[PDB]
Amino acid sequence: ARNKPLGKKLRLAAALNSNRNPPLWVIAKTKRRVTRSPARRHWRRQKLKA
Amino acid sequence: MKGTPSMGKHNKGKTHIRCPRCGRHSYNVTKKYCASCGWGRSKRWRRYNWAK
Amino acid sequence: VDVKRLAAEILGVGVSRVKISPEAVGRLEEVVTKDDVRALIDEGLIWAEPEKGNSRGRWRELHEKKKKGRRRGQGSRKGRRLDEEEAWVNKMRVMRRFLNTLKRQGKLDPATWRQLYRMVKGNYFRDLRHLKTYINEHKLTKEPVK
Amino acid sequence: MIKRFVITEKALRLAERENKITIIVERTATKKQIADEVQRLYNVKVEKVNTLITPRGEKKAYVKLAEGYSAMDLLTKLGVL
Amino acid sequence: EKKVVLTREYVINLRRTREVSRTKRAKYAVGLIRRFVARHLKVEPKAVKLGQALNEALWARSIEKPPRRVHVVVEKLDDGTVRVELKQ
């Protein structure tokens, strides 16, 4: 939406911050055990109920 | 019309939003309480024995 | 970057009218800012094709023919052109201002003005020439009206 | 109150051209508080403060210094440049 | 810079375009000229290059009405590529 409430906007900021895979050194640190994050999503596939 | 065409009308409305007390997507903005925790119509937390 | 997107906004024209010279293919990949597109527009490697306006020579020729009376026959008409309601407004205004001027100056008495004013409203007179002919023929005024 | 400075390409162009320093402050800091913090911390004069809340949830303030103080000088004095 | 080693005039016949679908006739005629020149000049079809004036002649009446025949000039360059241009 063009016009947002700040409470809804802040929750979108939290989702935006967490949407990222684990860094490449974490994969090396864990010997390829930690490769994926559950907070990873696509905007078109998984919809936040914000 | 009750199937796919009527599904296209669910793009702009809303019945519930996020509840401040429990954080779930269960706050009824018209009835003005939470369908999960009961915030706004009951100061005690809503929880029933028939639900696991 | 897309040079045509930048160049169209500099030139103030559509992106469909922005032309990049094929000689400047090497310099496209180096352009970073709008100042770099401004350098190329000054050099003439980016310009804008002049826009098309629909030519009106055929229309302007045809409009003279239509004024002379060509191309308006029965086989060229599909709907209503003459306004019947609008014609009545001009018919009353032409005849009323003529009659009112005559009475205002004094050449027509208010009594004889009334019968003609009501005859105008009653659709007795086809046009102004008919009204002038009636006024001249019946001698409703001392001096003939042109 | 201040969290850090913004030294991006846009922020650096602003400092040289419009005498503006870009900072990240607390999300609840107002324009009155940001102007007071900048003047107190750095001993300059603020003309106006333009503030926005970024899509990542932070507050960014474009502080325009008054016309006797250099925005780039304060950046280079702090050592954050 | 590339030098010419053989020049010929050819009258390519495009009557076959009237036997294919109307919506691909002008593009089909490009294939006819490439296969014609490849056959007569003994090169592959990808080695043939079409001049701009020839292309405009093929597309002059849009995709459905290419010309029935074209008078062309074929030139074989020193490196092996053949150039075809409309006779003008």
Add this chain to the structure above:
RNA sequence: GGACGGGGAACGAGCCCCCGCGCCCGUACCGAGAACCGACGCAGGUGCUCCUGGGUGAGAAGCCCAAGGCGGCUCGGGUGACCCCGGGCCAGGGAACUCGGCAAAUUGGCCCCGUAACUUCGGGAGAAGGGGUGCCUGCGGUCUUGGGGUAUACCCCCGGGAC
């Protein structure tokens, strides 16, 4: 905003010049035949919700072209059998087809003439039926809109516009 009353001070404006302050939240982008919903980069739905040049035209109709955009309703090439989906034409006959004129076909705009039974007197009615229709060369009219003539209408002259 104005009026009508009461109270108060010795100052003082709705006029002119000058000075100060204006916090908080939104602001990117799509807004849809790929950014929303429908499990999809879905021929549906939401939103064509509001706006848009020229020619023909009654017309915001259709057709062609601007401004502006697009070739991304995200496979390409060859062949030119049967068969299928969509489309065109068909001599003579003219519903003989078929449950059934289903489907297709016919008519079609505008102008003029003309128009029945019946009727709740309003209608029926575009009833029905007949004729005209292009292009070119000239001659006129009814207005309209400015300017110039003594000149507010009329009359004369000049330029533009419509029928």
Add this chain to the structure above:
RNA sequence: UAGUAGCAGCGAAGAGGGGUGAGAAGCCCCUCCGCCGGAAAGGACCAGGGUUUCCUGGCAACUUCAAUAGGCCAGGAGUUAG
């Protein structure tokens, strides 16, 4: 089953030359050809979506084919009000 069905239908579509590149019908540029033009298509914008926006680079996966393209992937940036 089977390297088979489908990737037609709903009134647009491509072609030539050059450049990039390991690799080009498909990416970039020019020329031609076409479609919309009171709009499945141009301008604005609500809800909803939430970074899809911009820049750089890339092609293991995604896109009914390809790809050096990309709403994809990686990195960085971006929304200023009396």
Add this chain to the structure above:
RNA sequence: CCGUGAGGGAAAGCUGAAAAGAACCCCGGAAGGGGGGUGAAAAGAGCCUGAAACCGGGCGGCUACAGUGGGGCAGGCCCGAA
């Protein structure tokens, strides 16, 4: 993650003793292949063992005038080390 919501709700364990996690050379656009190494053993990060279904190759028997599977007897070809 699914549903507007009340609510509903998965899949998914194992290198080696020690990374000693594969130096170096040729090829490839790259994934990667060959040679060469480490290790008791590739156990090679898609990592203990690694079945069947399934698919590819090699071998044995048949194969275009003969209607298929199971059993008994007879024969051909092939294997028949423990």
Add this chain to the structure above:
RNA sequence: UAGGCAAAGCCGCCCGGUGGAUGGCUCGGCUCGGGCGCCGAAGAAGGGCGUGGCAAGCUGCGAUAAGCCCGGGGUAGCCGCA
């Protein structure tokens, strides 16, 4: 006549690819027995958001944010899962 001699195809074995059974393992569960037993206006439980140099999740923590101070144990390493 039969063999050299073969198409497509069929059966068996071996090797390979796919797959993740089997076996071994186990910081997990389950059951039973014993104990202990309330927290909150001195603002709780629960939730949101944030917090790490490179950090997305979990765990911890709360703008003093994988942490600050004091004392006891513990002496040589430590900077959670990782």
